[PDB]
Amino acid sequence: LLLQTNLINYVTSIRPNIFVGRAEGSTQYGKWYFEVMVDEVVPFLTAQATHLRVGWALTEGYSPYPGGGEGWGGNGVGDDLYSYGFDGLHLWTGHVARPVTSPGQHLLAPEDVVSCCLDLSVPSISFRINGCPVQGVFEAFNLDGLFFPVVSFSAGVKVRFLLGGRHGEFKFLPPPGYAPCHEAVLPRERLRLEPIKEYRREGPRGPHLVGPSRCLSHTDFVPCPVDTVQIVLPPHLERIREKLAENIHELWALTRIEQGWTYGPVRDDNKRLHPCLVNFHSLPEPERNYNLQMSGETLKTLLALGCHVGMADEKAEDNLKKTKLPKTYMMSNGYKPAPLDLSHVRLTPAQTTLVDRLAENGHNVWARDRVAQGWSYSAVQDIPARRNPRLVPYRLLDEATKRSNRDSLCQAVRTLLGYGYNIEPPDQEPSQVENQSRWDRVRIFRAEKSYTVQSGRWYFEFEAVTTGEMRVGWARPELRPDVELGADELAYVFNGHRGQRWHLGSEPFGRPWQSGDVVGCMIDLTENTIIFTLNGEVLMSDSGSETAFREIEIGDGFLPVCSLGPGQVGHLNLGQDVSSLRFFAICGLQEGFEPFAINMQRPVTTWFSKSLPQFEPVPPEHPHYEVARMDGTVDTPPCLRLAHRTWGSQNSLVEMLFLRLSLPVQFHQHFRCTDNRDDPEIILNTTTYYYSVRVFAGQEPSCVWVGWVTPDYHQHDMNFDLSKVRAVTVTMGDEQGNVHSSLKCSNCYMVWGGDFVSPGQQGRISHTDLVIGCLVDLATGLMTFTANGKESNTFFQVEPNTKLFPAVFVLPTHQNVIQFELGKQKNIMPLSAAMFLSERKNPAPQCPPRLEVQMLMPVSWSRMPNHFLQVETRRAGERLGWAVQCQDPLTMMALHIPEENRC
Amino acid sequence: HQFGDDVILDDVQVSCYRTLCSIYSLGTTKNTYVEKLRPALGECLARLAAAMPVAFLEPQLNEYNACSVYTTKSPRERAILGLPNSVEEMCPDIPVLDRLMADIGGLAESGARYTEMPHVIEITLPMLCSYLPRWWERGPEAPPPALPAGAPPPCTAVTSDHLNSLLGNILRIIVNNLGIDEATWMKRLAVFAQPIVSRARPELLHSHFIPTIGRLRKRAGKVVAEEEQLRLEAKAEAEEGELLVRDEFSVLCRDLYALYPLLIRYVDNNRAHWLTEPNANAEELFRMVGEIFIYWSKSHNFKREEQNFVVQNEINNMSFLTADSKSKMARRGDRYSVQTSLIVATLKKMLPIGLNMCAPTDQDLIMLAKTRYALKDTDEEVREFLQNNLHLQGKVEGSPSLRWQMALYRGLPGREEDADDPEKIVRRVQEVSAVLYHLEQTEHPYKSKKAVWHKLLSKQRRRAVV
């Protein structure tokens, strides 16, 4: 009942820039291997034991933010359902430590070597300690994202990532088929050790605030060339494709010969030999069969794009400029090439863009075909293993290869225009990528409310290290994190990227900055004005107005605020050190404005918008959703009903809604060994509890999920389905197989209403109401469901001490959506008895005030720590690998909510 | 929109050449028609110079220029269509850039007047003002991208020196033609010359600006002294001579609106350096502008003469204030307002120099002097009042603000505590006090309900007055 306090160490996670995943058509390999070598570990640098864990983590969902989190903090590998770790004695997942048996079993100590193996096919994650097997595995986990190596640690650690080859020398041989992780570094990037989802970094003058990081997806590696299955070619293009094949083979021959190759009876990479060079006909049937289909794909794409190709000029075919290789020059063929000379031919930038897109498509078609054969990506080329550094879709391709393909295909288009066939570029068709979520895109940093100023002249500076989406200005203390700055009245901001001033909408104002520019934000509450300057120059609107905003009302007050988009970096100087203000003297000092923190001993405390969904009570005044507490009658039990206030109206908000009840039920520490009137002894000795959910007529059950969620559910998914539920299986066996235990862990236990809807070809709307019932035995850890009094096939088993909240996920299709029914079935106690100790033996259903509906909110304010762990990352050497070191301790006082198991 | 290099290529190039050379050749002709039509031709020629891709003034370096008919077209071309075969032979009547600048410098140093150099002022100077800026970006001293800079030589040879010399000579001309009763070319020359002021070097201030503003300030002092004497003697003969001082006020306002729009930009570029490293020349210019603004605030004739000049000549002053936004490219009250006035705008722009003069501790003394000015004490009177009330000067230990203000005050390089002397404090304090007092008086005129002409009686009763 009372909030608990304890001191906990800060924990930080470090990963290489290695991202591997599984997807259909993916160019990636499935099996990967890496090692971690411990050099120094201080078991107790503080009262709390040192933290060191090694494992894998998923890109989407693993967001261990510094400070508080699940449980008592110290979030690291295995503290969520997106990470899988090993501490030497245990396997970690779902913030649960499960012991695992190993020879010489001990906590991670100096000189220990941990070998981590990932197979994406099973899927399975396995470990070895000092070359010895670890008798436990993670399996059957979600593959929604990309996996990367990761180590989570507290202060007192020196560790070394060993990834293979030059970037690290393995001490124990990888198991067969498991590629070293150094082979996964992408062509455009270089191997490095980086933090995960950081909102803060150090920099020359001071800390830089960082926006969200653009991240790849498992689907990105899948090549997606344009559809061509309906391959139809006009006859004049059927004849010319073979000639195009001949000419591209000829240009290939030129590239080889100027590269210094020679006639080769046998193809071989190092020897500089290519059987293709010899003649346009003599070139082998294998290469013809390879590249004729490619030419056909090129033509069919030109058709798909909507370009019209026909015989514009017979004279171009009949007569053409005959290119002549210099008579001095010499080649192994003995036959001077002759491509179409086209210096008199001009291709417009439209056609250049089309060339780029066609090269993209050609590379992607090559990639899909070669993958279907079975090749995979590898930074190191291996032909017998069928690994290439180019089995990657065009976007990730290196600039050199991009340019090579672009030039080849541009000359192909030039040859076609020499043929004279008309080229019709298609009209530009815009599209929206939708890479990240609205909330995952923008991060807002504001000063703490205590620093609110209701009077005076105040100045502060914001330096933009990037030129992208960033907004800077003044906000009211009730600024909502989810809303973008300036859309509402709560903020008055400037967005240079487009030269805009935002307050209740966008208006042009000022000019965009360049990298390194400083924006000076000034507020005068005597004159009730806000002023913006750029590099000491006062920005002006599209008028003579020297002020961005006028007639402001002081009200509660104003606070300095900024927002950074993805890939954006800023530096906020509030003036604690006046000397560090570059443009204060030029503007503001004589005008009478004072730095925001001129005489503050400590740096201003900041809060940031955290895109970690958390459950919050439904506001009574929420425009779209209403909750009614129904008192129990003789026929009906106590209930909580959800109502859509704006249904069937313009401005109605229809989106998936995740709801839980405020209070959980906890399973026992120890599970037991192994006319409709409740029998008193049964109802008093029973350990089974019941609730139900009524889906009203008009609300589609297929759009309804009912069940329980653990307090670690943070997934706000608009396109929710039961397959998105996090899941993992921890399997423990003896030294030689013989699995003795297999436990399934998941945050969400639910049943779909579609499973109970009877199949109907028509008449999906039903006058009846669906009453889904949920039963849990708190002594056997068994969870069952009922449809309308009929037992459902679904059943779950959970471990002791598990906390479960009654949860409903629903997409509203009606004004009246759902009704939590806090009632009882015969010989089954209600949830009140489980929730409240005083009512353990009260069969009477009741809904106390504390019991309330909570709705998942995507974003919430979070205090930024004043100090951050100092982590040293380096490359010790080719053999030694990469090194991560943390030596200085940090501790925080943590406030822990027992019912929510968060801090 | 930087379209010139793509639009004006071969035949448009020839047509624009012909237009340019004809408009220039028109200079020799002298007629009433030419006098009336010269401004429009000058504007057209200036825009043509800004749009043209080639450097007709610098023909010798044409070969490096790619957007030229001579490079684009073969020598066998340009024969079918009549060309001289040489850019120089295109139309020689236009002299080269160096020759024109030498001529302009000679005119300025001689003291040539609009009558002797009407063609220059109205056609040539705008053309140069539009030519030099464009070619500065594409010539040496420009921010060079690696490959584009390293490979082709720049066709143009324009540097900031050319622009600085042109700006000095243009001033230099305005000061020669200050007193004249009729000068309509001044306002056009200012709008054409504004762009080239950004490259203006620091020395230009002491070299040119200080004498000009000093002469104008002296003339304003003489005019207001006259007005005071005319007041003192109150007659119909006093009403006579009111028109004379009026005309002096109008010519003063015309010269001010000619010079200031350039000074504002020169100030805007150098406020940062003047505030970082203190400059006595900038402080003197501040004193000048403050004196002029004081005269403006005290004399009713000067204010309304200014208003009349602006409305009659259709001066917007929007452009002068916001040409920064213009280069960016992103009812009577608005049509003209005091805040628009170049006098008050320049004073506000240069006031921070005045405050940098003043030590932060002196602020209290400044407030006392600002109230004495409200009592209408004289400058010497407030001076001696500050002199004998110096003891009141602020004490840093009492308030923390003064501590961090002193920190920066000492951080200023040239400032040392030994330089500060009681005469310095009193003089600077009373100067800034007068400026600030008149500034608040301008800002809050209390004009409300003074001379109401809402005519509520006649609006409710119009029929009866009829």
UniProtKB/Swiss-Prot annotation, chain A:
Effect of N130D: Impairs interaction with FKBP1A
The record's account of how the chain is modified after translation: The N-terminus is blocked. Channel activity is modulated by phosphorylation.
Result of changing R446W: Decreases protein stability
Region annotated Interaction with FKBP1A, chain positions: 40-51
Sequence repeats: 212-325, 326-439
Comment on protein domains: The calcium release channel activity resides in the C-terminal region while the remaining part of the protein constitutes the 'foot' structure spanning the junctional gap between the sarcoplasmic reticulum (SR) and the T-tubule. Pore opening is mediated via the cytoplasmic calcium-binding domains that mediate a small rotation of the channel-forming transmembrane regions that then leads to channel opening.
Family according to the record: Belongs to the ryanodine receptor (TC 1.A.3.1) family. RYR1 subfamily.
Other remarks in the entry: Binding of [3H]ryanodine indicates that the heterozygous channel is activated by Ca(2+) concentrations 4-fold lower than normal. Single-cell analysis of cotransfected cells shows a significantly increased resting cytoplasmic Ca(2+) level and a significantly reduced luminal Ca(2+) level.
Described function: Cytosolic calcium-activated calcium channel that mediates the release of Ca(2+) from the sarcoplasmic reticulum into the cytosol and thereby plays a key role in triggering muscle contraction following depolarization of T-tubules. Repeated very high-level exercise increases the open probability of the channel and leads to Ca(2+) leaking into the cytoplasm. Can also mediate the release of Ca(2+) from intracellular stores in neurons, and may thereby promote prolonged Ca(2+) signaling in the brain. Required for normal embryonic development of muscle fibers and skeletal muscle.
Name of this protein: Ryanodine receptor 1
